[PDB]
């Protein structure tokens, strides 16, 4: 239905698209005049034989054709200019919602694809719109102006040509039809096929060490050509359409004639016109031809623009008006909560009451798939809960919204999002309002981390492009800990384990974290032998649920299920 | 320059390419023979008004469009058919070369990059290869066999002509040359501007945590400007070319038209061959317009073609013949092997020296940095050595052939693949198959994969494809070791344990499992106190250069590393 819901969008830049269409009629107006103008010297200049308007001709032609340039190019241009301005709208609202979106409607896709969304999808919706309008308009204004044009010199002979249409129509598309049958069944089958390929291409290792070098050659080759033969499939009723296509069409170049011999057996008719019919068929077919595509697209254009408004319409999440509230380092209490992805298909929480203090630093127990992440998605909350309050001084839970949540409480990346600038704008972002460079940059000082900024490009001030990527990585997750700097930090989620960093830059970058994280709440999974009593504040979830909470050496001599975890994945 | 590397694997089918042309060069005859067919209508047929030339010529018309017609669709059947082995050819030595890959081939690579390359590849460079062909002498030929109607008429109308067309040629070279500059630093833009939008949108939970939807507001709104006003650049460049190349052909044609009527004022030709003329005009406008571009069109295939030979650049690896191995454990013995990925950059495995007994579990305690993932790697070779030896019982390094390594070697990966097959196919491919369905269908009874294999669709001879979407890669693994049945796999790695799995059917399987592995050397993913005290050994490695080897306790008494990662790890 789009187009009729689609001006909206479009609407206010219009007269891009005015000057469109009326360089557009004039456009084939210089066809079908320079086909005219163009032999009333065969009219005359042969048989009349006069040289006046012999040279009279060639320059009318020549300015015809310079209409005709000119026309065509700023036509096509301000076509893409009204279309221009028409995808930066869509693009950007499309972008701006579509980070409107709650987390799994980014997470189900992926950069990339999401990305192939945006561009190619509104580039699409352009590209289909434009062509096929300026088809559809264009070929009509020169069938149009030809035709009558067809009328101003046989009558007759006309009508019986424009007899012409309609054969060439239903023919031409029901052979479109057959061609859509076949781009159906070798599409499918092609991704199937593909797919297959992708697979072996997949599992050389397997291949390798089980020894299936002929199979895998040899069960594939046959794919090989297997592909090849729809391949030999879509070609062929691809090119049948011009054989079978002109016929027809040829016919009617063919029938004209012996009818035009039938006046001409009584002497219908001079020259000139009997050349103008033959123009008639070129010139008249090409927009025909043309029509046949340009309206089984038309369609295409509504086919992915009704899909992009698919994801369009999704919900961005609101709020009755929240938050700032009391700002603190506060007190972040799970409250008997319960949050589930979906409540049906895959259910995580289980009634989680755990209290953290202001100030106090906090450590966690656990286990993978027990959504040691997802406790992010609890009080970073990138989703609410499905039950109970997370309170700070019993703050509902839509009474807070993530806006000085997240400014009430911060993270320190898993790995950083970067933005290409001065780089003093990624670290600067973290709720900056001209601040100064002493504290952020004295946290690069003061933190230890001015080891991978002043050693680094552009010095101190440093601006890349590409991901902003080229700082040292362990080190720029302290230039994470650099914007929770800045953050007055209230309460503090980061993922520490023992896994892997490089060395003076490990105990530096955790030591030196333990500089920038002092009187201010702690949050993680608890790995280190160091850290599992420092941190004054423990607990153990269990498929979503807490059992046991306190210090290693309060749940130490507790005896729970808290050892346990600890000791089988840790 | 590889076109003579290349076609030469191209010669011997080339016959269907010779009907091919042969129909192509009559294909422009055609065209040039009715642009003939056009004035004996009015010089002859009208002139001397005569129902018999107008009474003829339509049936040869129609029977000449056939020629064409038919012809067609011999050149779009043959090339289809060339690619489908042109390219398939090309492709099966392809997938040879590319199965002859080992690892690091695959460590710079990805199956859509290499996958979607193959199709691509191939199927791009014998698309412009072939079109380059047809269109080339296609056209060459349109415009040859038109001379003659042209030439054979008025042969300096001609010539007054032919001087002309090759300034077209030129005009349409240096438009050519504006035109790739605009196809020089173009794809520059998209591909820079792109990869912004693409970190800006994958990065929302940076911007959703931190509230940079006022960045996303400026950020994205420039980068969207410059979104737009790079697309008016390439649709304003690409769109002026047309608007200019084309009118160029008045000057071509005025010039024809009156100063070539100053022969026709001197007694050039009669009134019927002027108007072929005109057409034989345009129909040289076509073809003309199309050889340049087959020059570009054409480079722009073959080099696919050489991104191709960059494909065959490399080489499928090799060796001097080794064996015949003896199939037994022995000892499996590592000899100081050293290697890292690439040589001298991700430190991974270097002087490791060990040796293992029959029936011996081997526990993986270890950690990263030391490749405890990557161990295997060497001595299932999915790499080969830097230095040192590969050896059981002085098995040389160089007397066991990579070949029969695959074969004695053996596997259970932390993952798992299948072959196209039924649930008993999939697992006939270990030892070539060739046997019966008997102690198979049993080797899964004992495998305690029976129950998920029979009770699917197909009963116990399940036909699930695609490798049986619905059998889970613990699944896939369990009933795979039966296919370590097939193997009798001598030589064991695998993971189970408290890594990932559900711990009901782990233990169940891995009692079945290593029921099964009995008998034969064994090793694993420490992490259960089930295995690290039933094993009888335990090793530990720093840094891919071993700390230790032997027996458990006697190194958990060690003081060392050993009673480390049984703290920090388990």
Known sequence: QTFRRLWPTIAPFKAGLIVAGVALILNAASDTFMLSLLKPLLDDGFGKTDRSVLVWMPLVVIGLMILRGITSYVSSYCISWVSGKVVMTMR??????????????????????????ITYDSEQVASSSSGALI?????????????????????????????????????????????????????????????????????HKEVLIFGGQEVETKRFDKVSNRMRLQGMKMVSASSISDPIIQLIASLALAFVLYAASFPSVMDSLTAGTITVVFSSMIALMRPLKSLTNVNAQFQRGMAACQTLFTILDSEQEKDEGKRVIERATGDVEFRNVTFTYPGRDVPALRNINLKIPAGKTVALVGRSGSGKSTIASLITRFYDIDEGEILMDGHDLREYTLASLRNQVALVSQNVHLFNDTVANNIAYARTEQYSREQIEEAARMAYAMDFINKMDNGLDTVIGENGVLLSGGQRQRIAIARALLRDSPILILDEATSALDTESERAIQAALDELQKNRTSLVIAHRLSTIEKADEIVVVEDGVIVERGTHNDLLEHRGVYAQLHKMQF
Chains 1, 2 share one sequence.
Do not use: C
Not at 98 to 110: E, H, I, L, N, R
Not at 184 to 199: F, L, P, Y
């Open 92 to 117: 950007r609202r499309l972008f701006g919602h579509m980070m409107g979106m709650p987390v799994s409607f980014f997470d189900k896709q992926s950069t990339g694809t999401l990305l192939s969304r």
């Open 135 to 203: 088809t559809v308009v264009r070929e009509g204004a020169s069938i149009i102006g030809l035709f009558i044009m067809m009328f101003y010199y046989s009558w007759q002979l006309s009508i019986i040509l424009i007899v012409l249409a309609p054969i060439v129509s239903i023919a031409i598309r029901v052979v479109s039809k057959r061609f859509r049958n076949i781009s159906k069944n070798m599409q499918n089958t092609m991704g199937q096929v593909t797919t297959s390929a992708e697979q072996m291409l997949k599992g």
